[PDB]
C-alpha cells in the first residue's frame, strides 16, 4: 500500500478533507489526535513521560499539567527531542499495529498538520497539503470557537501556508466553496488508486 501524508494549517480543513477521503474509501489516521490521547492515564505513553520526565514534576493530581510539561520542554531542547522521540515511537509502533489488519491496495492517509516542518513528509511517498488563506482559517477557527490569540498562537508556529503549497505533489485548495473542495479530494483519490 502507498503510505500518503495529508498536511496543511489549522482551521484548513484537514478534518473536513480528512472525512471526505474516507467516505471515498480510504482510511485517514489523524496523528495528532491520536498523539494527545498519549497523555491521558493509563496509556502506556503516559507511563513513559512521567518516568522520563519526573514522577510529579509534570503531575496536577492524577494526570499531566500539559502546561507544565510544555514548560520545562522548553528551555533546552534536549528534552523536547526526549519527547517528541516517545511520542514518534509510539505513532511508528501503532501505525504498523493498524497496518496489520488493513487489507492491500487501501489508500492509508496521515494527518499531521506538521509533516513538513517537523520534517517527516519523506516518510511517506507523496504528500497532500490543503491551501487557505490566513483571514479564511482565523474565522474559521473562529466560528468553532477557539479565541483569537490562542489560534495565532499556534497558527505562528506553522510555517506560511503561501510556502507549504510548494511541498506537496497535490493542492485541494478550501478557501472557495464545498463543492469544489469536494470534487478536488474525488480528483486526486482517482489519481491515487489508478
Not at 158 to 163: A, D, S
Amino acid at each position: 500500500m502507498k503510505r500518503i501524508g495529508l498536511t496543511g494549517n489549522i482551521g484548513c480543513g484537514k478534518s473536513t478533507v480528512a472525512q471526505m477521503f474516507r467516505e471515498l474509501g480510504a482510511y485517514v489516521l489523524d496523528a495528532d489526535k491520536l498523539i494527545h490521547s498519549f497523555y491521558r492515564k493509563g496509556h502506556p505513553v503516559y507511563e513513559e513521560v512521567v518516568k522520563t520526565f519526573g514522577k510529579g514534576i509534570l503531575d496536577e493530581e492524577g494526570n499531566i499539567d500539559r502546561k507544565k510539561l510544555a514548560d520545562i520542554v522548553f528551555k533546552d531542547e534536549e528534552k523536547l527531542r526526549k519527547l517528541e522521540e516517545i511520542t514518534h515511537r509510539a505513532l511508528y509502533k501503532e501505525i504498523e499495529k493498524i497496518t496489520k489488519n488493513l487489507s492491500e491496495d487501501t489508500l492509508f492517509i496521515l494527518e499531521a498538520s506538521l509533516l513538513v516542518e517537523k520534517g517527516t513528509y519523506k516518510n511517506y511517498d507523496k504528500l497532500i497539503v490543503v491551501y487557505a488563506p490566513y483571514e479564511v482559517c482565523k474565522e474559521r477557527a473562529i466560528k468553532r470557537g477557539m479565541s483569537e490569540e490562542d489560534f495565532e498562537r499556534r497558527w505562528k508556529k506553522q510555517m506560511p501556508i503561501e510556502e507549504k503549497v510548494k511541498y506537496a505533489d497535490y493542492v485541494i485548495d478550501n478557501s472557495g466553496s464545498i463543492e469544489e473542495t469536494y470534487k478536488q479530494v474525488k480528483k486526486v483519490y482517482e489519481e491515487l488508486t489508478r
